[PDB]
Symmetry: C2
Subunit: 190 residues, 2 copies
């Protein structure tokens, strides 16, 4: 069923960067998530609707990476500039909004909310990697910040099909709407 | 294994209020979550460490409840003052910190971060209901805000054992530490 969308809608794409799109993920590959996101981005730009590309960086020195105590030790911060560069197939344009984050979710320490508010945006369409981590944290926070959230099922991927299903069926329906890229495109054309 | 805790630690208990503790939940009841939390609270107060009790309210008129579009329609806001009153068995004291929230997580629209910062707190021990909703959203945000987060496995409950297990094994170990109430108490006594 096609999601309900206000005209004041933005596309927000999480962590479609070289170091993350090459990771193993399901139910579609990093490449497919990138491709789907680009297709949606074209539909948004066609309507003069903002496209917001989010990437994670710990430049210049890694000191901004969280070092809080966790049971699962995190990877050390990757300081290769290519790690945080956008996937070339994503088609990031010079007038697109680029948001740089330093943790899972895309609000903390960023200008995402500033960009949304100042552009009059009420609704966000969310894509990216990983469904349960950067996507979900952004989704949860966006909901608390009174945005209508739509998550694109065939443009979010994660580490297992169980995790995908859990987020899409147990969490996201409670904080927003779950739809396919095609469903979202149809809701725009309305 | 006992969690690692700095001395600058607070107990933060989510939504142990009449309207939520009576809900069906696993792997322990609302009553058990309340009891366990009170026991920990005693251990914290004994050490002059802050105890922060969080509840959800939509008083006076329900207008502050989120009305964003979701696939699963939410319950209308319950405006019975008893719905948001703390469970009597929780033993909330007049010098305890009471935080009032209007959505899942305990930071948005609250003084939680202000209370933590001003009290010099670096570490939070988290209890309450539901594991995947108010507890997890608070945990996720606390992590992004550079707090060491510990979630108390036998003092958080949710709607299914699959959901409990997913949060405790797939999410929380990546943003903090998972331990039992007894483990936490032992880490204090160190």
């Amino acid at each position: 069923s096609i999601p309900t969308l206000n005209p004041t809608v933005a596309l927000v794409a999480i962590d479609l960067q070289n170091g993350i799109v090459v990771l193993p993920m399901v139910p579609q590959s990093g490449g497919d998530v990138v491709a789907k996101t680009a297709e949606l981005a074209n539909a948004f730009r066609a309507r003069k609707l903002p496209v917001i590309f989010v990437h994670t960086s710990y430049q210049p020195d890694g000191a901004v990476a969280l070092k809080v105590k966790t049971d699962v030790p995190p990877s050390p911060p990757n300081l290769d500039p290519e790690w945080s560069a956008f996937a070339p197939a994503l088609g990031v344009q010079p007038l697109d909004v680029v948001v740089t984050k330093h943790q899972w979710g895309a609000f903390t320490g960023t200008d995402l909310d500033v960009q949304l508010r100042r552009r009059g945006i009420t609704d966000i369409v969310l894509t990216g990697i990983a469904t349960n981590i950067g996507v979900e944290s952004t989704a949860r926070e966006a909901y608390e910040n009174n945005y209508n959230v739509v998550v694109v099922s065939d443009a979010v991927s994660t580490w297992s099909t169980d995790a995908q299903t859990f987020a899409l069926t147990q969490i996201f329906p409670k904080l927003g709407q779950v739809a396919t890229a095609a469903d979202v495109e149809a809701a725009l054309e309305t």
